[PDB]
Swiss-Prot record, chains A, B:
Disulfide bonds: none annotated. It is an enzyme of class 3 (hydrolase). This is Uncharacterized hydrolase SAUSA300_2518. The keyword Kinase does not apply.
Length: 277, 277
């Protein structure tokens, strides 16, 4: 459907309509070129209009993961790579410098195209740029951006998992260990990533997955249910009590809490050896 | 020093220590086998202990993207693939069925190993399972997992972006359009994933990127600043006013607001044609 330009680390997809000199539209927050298509129809008699899906969005696809440092708020990897994508797109489509319009965060991509690859720019428009770096009050706006990201991404996660743990009657030691911040700032970014992945891709999917009581009954002789000695009253123990009630499969108590295997490894092992050694 | 097993779609990494019959530990929310290493030390004289990084975590790596459907909350792709990984690992390390212990969400993986690959299971233990599907009050626990995810992913973003838009004095028409819930359930999932990505990886990095006014004065003759006529008073217009004040680069007014190119594509095009056609 869309056109493709294969670049280092990505397949860049774009829409193309019209005839005449090339005019590249760079999208803002939505990331995709489809938002420009009604506009392109109005221009297609005068320009070859090109509307880009920036490489992290839409029908574009990465061919290798983002660098770990891209999560750093001062990383320049993505904005420069987006600008290089536009410059390479222009060079692929035109032997002459081209017309470029970016809007909002796409206007910032456009500014980096002019800075890094001026040779591809005939004319350029910055539609409502939100860049703050050169403003006299840059700090105020930078701090507002930093704080809203921190509120939505970090604060929301921290507060939600605390109250969720309490509603499930998770023991304090488990709540602390499952939430404990990594000792390194490289580890804390991974940890956020891992926890958000688990929330979006694991908790709902796994806890409501296709296991029935009859699955337990059929292999009852193979199964041990384990409840921690330090996590009594918590929701997972009620799950085991229900399995036991309906199947007769024994519950064995084992030292520690939800994370008892690392809290009390000697005692945890002693029970496993009684079971299976 | 971790071991590796190449499987469909992933390189599965795992710790291996000890001697004796194979005992595989499946981690829960942390996703990684290292949390079992102190326990492994206590068991290594009786078992070949195998502590897995499940394929989406730790030193494991995917070799092809997750299916687009994995973000759906009723997807079963990941749990079934995790169970298949454990069964394939078991077969690679042992000709006999093996001992398996999973904890928390990893106990759910263990349950699916027993259900779909009982032939690899000698004995199995479910440590503090949080699965709710077969519970008499499953709806209660399921809707609560769904709610905690919705609160952290969706509502925190909704509420934050609303306040953010008031700090930036974004026009109501643009606020509504940039936040409008998509018309399909899957479109809403993609929409919030895209905004979360933009918040972590774009807003801070791009708006405080290294652009100076000197970068514009070098090519002042090629640059047009565009202000929407329906977005007066908003922060991006102030950015354009500062650029124009300091550099003399012209501001051209254009129909619509921050999203004017799709709000009023005919009027937007008319101005571009005046500029450049
Ligand atoms: O704080 B966490 O990241 C976490 C992971 S699993 C679980 C279960 C109950 C409460 C919190 C948690
Ligand atoms: O609501 B959004 O997803 C959004 C994207 S950019 C921006 C700027 C101000 C207020 C909201 C937004
Ligand atoms: B355009 O999407 C826009 C208007 S205000 C603001 C942006 C983009 C990033 C930060 C702030
Ligand atoms: B084990 O990490 C645990 C205790 S309560 C709960 C889980 C996992 C998923 C949902 C709830
Ligand atoms: Ca076309
Ligand atoms: Ca470059
Ligand atoms: Ca330059």
């Amino acid at each position: 459907g869309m056109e493709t330009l294969e670049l280092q680390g990505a397949k860049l997809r774009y829409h193309q309509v019209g005839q005449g000199p090339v005019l590249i539209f760079i999208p803002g927050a939505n990331g995709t070129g489809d938002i420009f298509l009604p506009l392109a129809e109005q221009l297609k008699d005068h320009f070859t209009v090109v509307a880009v899906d920036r490489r992290d969005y839409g029908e574009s696809e990465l061919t290798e993961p983002l660098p770990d440092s891209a999560s750093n708020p001062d990383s320049d990897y993505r904005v420069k790579r987006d600008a290089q994508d536009i410059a390479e797109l222009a060079k692929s489509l035109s032997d002459e410098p081209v017309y470029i319009l970016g809007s909002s965060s796409g206007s910032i991509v456009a500014m980096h195209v002019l800075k890094d690859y001026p040779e591809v720019v005939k004319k350029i428009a910055f539609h409502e740029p939100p860049i703050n770096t050169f403003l006299p009050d840059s700090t105020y706006w930078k701090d507002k951006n930093d704080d809203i990201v921190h509120q939505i991404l970090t604060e929301g996660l921290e507060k939600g998992m605390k109250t969720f743990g309490e509603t499930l009657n998770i023991a304090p030691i488990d709540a602390k260990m499952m939430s404990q911040p990594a000792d390194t700032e490289e580890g804390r970014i991974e940890q956020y990533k891992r926890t958000m992945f688990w929330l979006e891709f694991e908790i709902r999917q796994y806890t409501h997955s296709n296991i029935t009581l009859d699955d337990f009954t059929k292999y009852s002789d193979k199964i041990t249910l384990l409840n921690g000695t330090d996590s009594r009253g918590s929701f997972p123990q009620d799950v085991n009590f229900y399995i036991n009630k309906e199947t007769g499969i024994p519950i064995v108590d084992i030292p520690g809490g939800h994370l008892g295997y690392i809290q009390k490894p000697e005692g945890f092992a002693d029970v496993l050896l009684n079971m299976w050694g």
